[PDB]
Amino acid sequence: SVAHGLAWSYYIGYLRLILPELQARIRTYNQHYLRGAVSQRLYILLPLDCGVPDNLSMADPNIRFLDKLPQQTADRAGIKDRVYSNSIYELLENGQRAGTCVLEYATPLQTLFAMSQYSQAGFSREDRLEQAKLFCQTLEDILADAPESQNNCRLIAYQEFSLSQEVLRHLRQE
Amino acid sequence: SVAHGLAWSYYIGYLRLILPELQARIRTYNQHYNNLLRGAVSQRLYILLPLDCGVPDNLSMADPNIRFLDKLPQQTADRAGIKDRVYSNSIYELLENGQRAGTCVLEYATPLQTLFAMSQYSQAGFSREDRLEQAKLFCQTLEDILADAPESQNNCRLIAYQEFSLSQEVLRHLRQE
Ligand SMILES: COc1cc2sc(C(=O)CCC(=O)O)cc2cc1OCCCOc1cc2sc(C(=O)CCC(=O)O)cc2cc1OC
Secondary structure: OHHHHHHHHHHHHHHHHHHHHHHHHHHHHHHHOOOOOOOOOEEEEEEOOOOOOOOHHHHOOOEEEEEEOOOEEEEEOOEEEEEEOOEEEEEEEOOEEEEEEEEEEOOHHHHHHHHHHOHHHOOOHHHHHHHHHHHHHHHHHHHOOOHHHHHOEEEEEEOOOOHHHHHHHHHOOO | OHHHHHHHHHHHHHHHHHHHHHHHHHHHHHHHHOOOOOOOOOOOEEEEEEOOOOOOOOHHHHOOOEEEEEEOOOEEEEEOOEEEEEEOOEEEEEEEOOEEEEEEEEEEOOHHHHHHHHHHOHHHOOOHHHHHHHHHHHHHHHHHHHOOOHHHHHOEEEEEEOOOOHHHHHHHHHHOO
C-alpha cells in the first residue's frame, strides 16, 4: 500500500501535469534543430532494485546527455511558475547513435530505497522488491485509463547489464 | 499507509533536497533582490496542510490578504537524470487591516491533493470518508520525520488546519517566532 499511494501520487502530482504538454515541447525542439529528431514520449526508468542515480552517463556510458528540452512552467499549489525541466539523451550502440529520447528515473522508487534504510520508516528491505513491482503495476493500471498520458510515456522496468540496450529495445518496439 | 508513504516521499523526494539550501536563497533575496525599503523575507518554508486536502494553485484566491510579492532565486540540481532540475518557490505578503504584517516563502504540500484525487477515483480503492484520517496521518508522519532531521525542521514550519482566514493562520505561526 506504500507503493500503491506512491504510484497514484506520481501520476496525480507529476505525470498528469507534464504528459499533455510533452508532445509540443518535443516538436518545438525538433523544429529548431526520423532518428535525428528526438523521439516522442517520456521514457521512465523503473529499476526494481530502487537504485536511482542522479547522473545517467554514470549508470551506462552509452547514454550521453545531449540537451535540456525547453522547460514547462505552471502555477502549482502556490508556487508561481513551478518549473518542469526534462533532459534529452543519445543512446549509443557500438560507437554509433542508435536513438535519442527524453529520459528520467521515477523518483518515488528512491523513497522505497530510503524507507528500507531508515528504522523509523518501519519498512523492511525484504519487502522492497514486492513494493517496487507494485509501484510499476499500479502506474501501468492508472495509465491504461489516461490515454493522453499513456501515449506520451513508456515504462522501462528492469532487474539487473546494459541500461542503453534496455532503453533501445523499447525505442525499437515502435 | 498511503499517507505514511506520501509523507516519507515528500521528505525524501523534496524537502530533504530544498531545505538545506533555502537559508542561502532567502539571504540572497534579502541582500540583492528584495525592494530596498521593505522588511526582510522571514526564514523557513511555510508549508500549508489543509486537512480537507483542498490544494488550489493560486493563494490570493484562497485569501485576498495573501498577496504574491516575488519568486525566490531558483535552485537547480541534477536529479534522477534531469540535468539542472529546477526548484522554484514563491514569496508572499500577509496583510492585516490593509497593511503588511509579514512576508514569507509559502506553498501547499502537494501530496494532500493526491489524497483528494484518490478519494474521487474508483480504481484508487480509497473511500471518500478516509480522507481526513489520511490527511492527519500525513501531517503527523511529516512532523515525526522532521523531528529527526535538525536542519530541515529549522528550515520549515508546518501549518495544519481545518476550516476562515488563511492569512491569520499563517501570521499566528510567523508571530510565534
Ligand atoms: C505530489 O506528489 C508528487 C509530486 C511529484 S513532482 C515530481 C517531479 O517533479 C519529478 C522529479 C523529482 O522528483 O524532482 C515527482 C513527484 C512525485 C509525487 O508523488 C510521489 C509521492 C510524494 O513524494 C513526492 C512529493 C514531491 S512534492 C515535489 C515538488 O516539486 C513540490 C511541488 C510540486 O509537487 O509540484 C516533489 C516531490 C517528489 C516526491 O517523490 C519523489
